[PDB]
């Protein structure tokens, strides 16, 4: 087919990357982490809509990896909330130990030219992102440290809310969007170099997000609420509000966000509610933001990883322009990392101070005493 | 005078590497790692053994940074021991933001190439290292990723016991030196290139350790035993397994292990330890760990950074060879340091396997039946 050629043809001519996949949390259910001679399970899956056989199938080019994990639920708020940082370490250690494992499928990435350098070697290229601020437990020093460990996301919430935001699903609201000190992170997380996504947010707290954001962000995985009314959606005015922060709206293969009923959820819906966005708020604000692995059954024709090939030949059928496909399949969010680096070289390159941590004090005055005492001493030697 | 012109030839041929400095902590105790707007006090403080000014007035050719937090004190187990993961990584975060925000002085390094590299651009080589197993929570994959932000020492206890070894100063003895998970704990430190310090560790451990261990080791700040009787110092027996293990003990300027009375403690006594170690398993063998800013005041001769002229110069005025005391300065650490990375790149090159966590399952039975035919429904597609 002349259609597929096409499609086949722009998944090598540019990396399709994709906004958000959870199969390093299908490894924690599975195999518990222990990847040790798996291999043959790794490539061929009993579970999921994720392996390393069908990514190479559906030419994905590059991922955004989720190191998710669930919302404290512990009684005891000090020990959920530390539970979840000691979790989030292990989820980017699986990440990292299956990428580094795996090197002739998956390399490694952290910045665009890390992406297409990926890209050029034949690799997925393979990026990080947390899903919740639950996972840093109040840490903006934890934070700082998981952007060394190679996350280049930060979802503000998953399905609750934090001491930062107020996630979409649950009622009532705590702080009605951002609390004070959600509004003093969205500073650092444009100082540090780190995507804000807005997926899982509130309305409310996507409205104030965009507007105080001085970096583009993205939607790693949510739809649109004018074809289907949905919390987790994005509503015509935080579109508008997308393109002026210059972010991307990475479209969602949830079947509850794509059709009322979700069995009669399609390609056909996903491509509806990319032409929807990029016809608004133009190509180059829209991206994939699949959710696989975040579900157990994809729409009809989006079943797992190996069938990109089909939403990019139908994006394509249905009018969308050569030019404009590579911006969706990850052209757009390529420039959104590269806007987001090039944001936070200009802060750091000015010297702007970075957000501490509030800390208890550790010396009593007359500990404090005795080394001005000391160092005194040592000045009269 | 000629033997101080010798030892400033010296300290400019050759970088002098101190094993272990808790300047970090200083400013977790003073600045409560707030270090915005204070370069003034960060370059002349006014409490302990370590600044900018007298870093560089001392001739320090390098550093291991200590990210030491205290063993913990909370009756619930799970929180405390959770909290020291976090304080980990907000030590961890104020070492890397020390180092990024004065490049003129500090300057980050993780390797024998690295610490050449700084070295030769005239910066003091700043790698770090943790203080204790407890600081990791019983967490391998925490472990791995603190390798990951630059971690390439671990002291196996402070003072306290862990899961994994017994600490010297604390009475009874736990595991009776190294457990079941400590000596697991040693194949997997060896695996990823971790550098094992056994200083703090009770001489039981250190033997099983020493033996256990197919990477050279070292202890970052210990003295010696016969010299002067401490659970803190090196027996004879143990110097000599360092030396089979082909590792270094790297001396402590702490008075306590340098003499009977704290007060009379002196530069002399530091050059007695070297000697000693020298004379008995050769001075490849020999360090220097000062563990400034881990006491409130030195040796007379050695009260702080500003100091180590007068001991490379005190090296060479008892007789050390000019070859000898260069080793003893920091190629001797560099050597372990590299002999551990190429024990990694060995293991990691034969494809071992890694230590894995022990972690709850996540799904029941239901839900993994689910999965399966739901992939089943997939393949049938
Ligand atoms: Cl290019
Ligand atoms: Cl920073
Ligand atoms: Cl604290
Ligand atoms: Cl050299
Ligand atoms: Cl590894
Ligand atoms: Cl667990
Ligand atoms: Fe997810
Ligand atoms: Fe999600
Ligand atoms: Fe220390
Ligand atoms: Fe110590």
């Known amino acids: 087919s002349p259609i597929e050629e096409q499609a086949t043809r722009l998944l090598k001519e540019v990396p399709l990357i994709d906004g958000h996949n959870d199969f390093p949390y299908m490894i924690r259910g599975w195999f518990r982490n222990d990847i040790n001679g798996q291999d043959a399970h790794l490539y061929d899956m009993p579970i999921g809509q994720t392996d390393l056989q069908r990514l190479q199938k559906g030419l994905l080019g590059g991922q955004f990896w989720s190191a998710f994990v669930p919302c404290p639920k512990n009684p005891d708020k000090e020990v959920g909330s530390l539970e979840a940082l000691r979790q989030t370490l292990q989820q980017l250690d699986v990440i990292h130990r299956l990428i580094e494992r795996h090197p002739t499928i998956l390399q490694f990435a952290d910045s665009a030219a890390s992406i297409w350098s990926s890209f050029r070697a034949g690799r997925v290229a393979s990026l990080i992102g947390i899903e919740g601020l639950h996972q840093i437990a109040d840490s903006v020093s934890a934070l700082r440290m998981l952007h060394r460990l190679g996350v280049r996301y930060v979802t503000l919430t998953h399905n609750c809310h934090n001491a930062f935001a107020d996630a979409a699903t649950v009622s009532p609201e705590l702080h009605g969007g951002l609390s004070r000190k959600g509004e003093r992170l969205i500073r650092e997380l444009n100082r540090m170099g780190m995507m804000i996504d807005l997926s899982h947010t509130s309305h409310e707290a996507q409205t104030q997000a965009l507007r105080l954001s001085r970096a583009p962000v993205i939607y790693s995985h949510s739809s649109i609420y004018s074809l289907r009314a949905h919390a987790r959606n994005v509503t015509d005015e935080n579109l ?142």
């Open 240 to 381: 508008h509000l997308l393109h002026r922060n210059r972010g991307v709206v990475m479209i969602c293969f949830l079947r509850e966000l794509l059709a009322s009923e979700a069995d009669q959820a399609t390609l056909a819906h996903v491509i509806d509610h990319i032409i929807y966005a990029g016809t608004r708020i133009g190509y180059e604000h829209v991206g994939i933001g699949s959710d696989f692995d975040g579900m157990l059954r994809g729409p009809d024709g989006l079943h797992d990883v190996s069938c990109y090939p089909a939403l990019v030949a139908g994006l394509l059928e249905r009018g969308v322009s050569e030019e404009d496909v590579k911006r969706v399949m990850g052209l757009n969010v390529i420039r959104v990392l590269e806007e987001v680096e090039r944001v936070a070289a200009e802060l750091q390159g000015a010297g702007e101070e970075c957000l501490c941590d509030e800390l208890d004090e550790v010396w009593n005055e007359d500990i404090k005493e005795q080394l001005t005492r000391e160092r005194e001493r040592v000045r009269k030697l």
